[PDB]
Structure 1
Amino acid sequence: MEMEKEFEQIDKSGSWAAIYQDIRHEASDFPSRVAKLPKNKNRNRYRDVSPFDHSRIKLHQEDNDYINASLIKMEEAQRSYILTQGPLPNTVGHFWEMVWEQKSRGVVMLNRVMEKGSLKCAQYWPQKEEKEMIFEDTNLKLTLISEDIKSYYTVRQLELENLTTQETREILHFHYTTWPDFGVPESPASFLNFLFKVRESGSLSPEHGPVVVHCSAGIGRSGTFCLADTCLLLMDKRKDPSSVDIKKVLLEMRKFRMGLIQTADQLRFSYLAVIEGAKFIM
Structure 2
Amino acid sequence: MEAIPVKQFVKHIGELYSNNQHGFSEDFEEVQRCTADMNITAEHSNHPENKHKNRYINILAYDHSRVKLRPLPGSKHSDYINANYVDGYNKAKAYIATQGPLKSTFEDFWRMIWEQNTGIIVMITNLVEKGRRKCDQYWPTENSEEYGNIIVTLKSTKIHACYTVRRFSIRNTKNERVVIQYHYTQWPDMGVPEYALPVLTFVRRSSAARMPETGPVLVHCSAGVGRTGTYIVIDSMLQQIKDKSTVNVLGFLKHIRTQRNYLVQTEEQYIFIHDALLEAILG
TM-score (norm 2): 0.90
1:9 corresponds to which letter in structure 2?
E
Q: Hey, what's the Cα distance between the residues in 2 that align with 1:133 and 1:180?
A: 30
Partner of 1:197: 205
2:86 corresponds to which letter in structure 1?
I
- Which 10-residue stretch deviates more, 72-81 or 223-232? 72-81
Q: Hey, what's the Cα distance between the residues in 1 that align with 2:93 and 2:71?
A: 27
Q: Could you give the per-residue CA deviations for residues 199-237 of structure 1, whole angstroms, max 9, x where no partner exists? A: 232x2x440110101000001000011101111111222
Q: Hey, what's the Cα distance between the residues in 2 that align with 1:237 and 1:264?
A: 27
1:186 corresponds to which letter in structure 2?
E
Answer yes or no: is the 8 Å Cα contact 1:107–1:174 preserved in 2: yes
Partner of 1:5: 11
1:195 corresponds to which letter in structure 2?
V
Mapping of residues 260-275 of structure 1, within 5 Å: 260-275=263-278
Unpaired runs of 5+ residues, structure 2, are: none
CA RMSD of aligned residues (A): 1.6
The CA deviation at 1:76 is 2.4
- Which 10-residue stretch deviates more, 58-67 or 207-216? 58-67
Answer yes or no: is the 8 Å Cα contact 1:79–1:230 preserved in 2: no
The CA deviation at 1:279 is 3.3
| Shift in alpha-carbon separation, 1:79–1:95, aligned structure 2, 3 A | closer
3-state DSSP of counterpart to 2:103: coil
- Counterpart among 39, 49, 54 of residue 44 in structure 1: 54
The CA deviation at 1:61 is 1.8
The CA deviation at 1:79 is 6.6
TM-score (norm 1): 0.90
* Percent identity over paired residues: 35
Partner of 2:237: 231
1:251 and 2:254 matched: yes
1:160 and 2:170 matched: yes
Q: Could you give the per-residue CA deviations for residues 1-48 of structure 1, whole angstroms, max 9, x where no partner exists? A: 732222222222122333211210113541101110110000001111
Unpaired runs of 5+ residues, structure 1, are: none
Partner of 1:125: 139
Partner of 2:223: 217
Q: Hey, what's the Cα distance between the residues in 2 that align with 1:17 and 1:216?
A: 25
Partner of 1:83: 97
Q: Hey, what's the Cα distance between the residues in 1 that align with 2:206 and 2:113?
A: 16
3-state DSSP of counterpart to 2:104: coil
1:87 corresponds to which letter in structure 2?
P
